[PDB]
Amino acid sequence: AEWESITPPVVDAPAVVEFFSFYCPPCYAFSQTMGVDQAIRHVLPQGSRMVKYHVSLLGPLGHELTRAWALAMVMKETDVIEKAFFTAGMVEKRLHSPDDVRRVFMSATGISRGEYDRSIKSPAVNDMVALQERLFKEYGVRGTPSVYVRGRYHINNAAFGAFSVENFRSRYAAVVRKLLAG
Template structure:
């Protein structure tokens, strides 16, 4: 009789087990805002000086290819790299304004982490830009511009809003923060992001 009851309970619970979500709040992700954005977006907070961000860059590139309809954003933080943190944050914003971010970001990562050539000032950042095809006068025109200062303020505001204290930090739809240490593999990273993009 006990075996029969156990079998019946197992059968009754089976549909519930199958309906269990693949990923769980508090494990693979954390809810950091009550209201998600209305658009499919993934935001990575990063720093050029962060070795984990350097290693993570190919995953973000692949994510953009896998999710062509999603908006992939990068937010440079200023709290890493000591006095160079704000300089490198400004360098990223300048690359965006000059429409060379796709070209300059791999260059900056490579110089810092593979070549061990850390730019020591905004002048050295300019040299990197110029060496990679950016007109020096165009760089000068944006590096302290009103538009770039506004972008820096937005970067800092978002960093504070999501209480970002380490990088890379990935936020999906402005509501879910990935718990990178719990995801475990590249494939699971993609699947968690896709799951959260479709979540309520």
């Protein structure tokens, strides 16, 4: 059950923040196969939110995915986009080029080619890319997945033990739950 205070804290932080990458196997596991993200959402106090931010440093398409995610966030389509990009990469192994990124985004959302091309570079998406890169530095992010609670506690992924997905998930969420208490 381990975690470390970050310094300095982030003010006005969402209750839970997770920095992740579509190239990060444990991120794939948290989101898509082990139900850790879901178990965390399940202990969110009323009114609190979990927000996910993509990190650019990892992999060939790092920056393109971050911008694609920025677009998802602007459009309120993170749910379908998250599932789509993990399937495309981890599962199907067909995320190699910038055209792939746009193709998967369009297929998941139904957005048109022309709207994607105009939107992907919109001021609002530009802002959301800025925000992701800004917060990477403020939270002191060092890798992925990096889960932060109330802008002050960084969960230590490497401090949990279990023989099963089910115990691992429960113990990870138990610690997040504890840190959300108040």
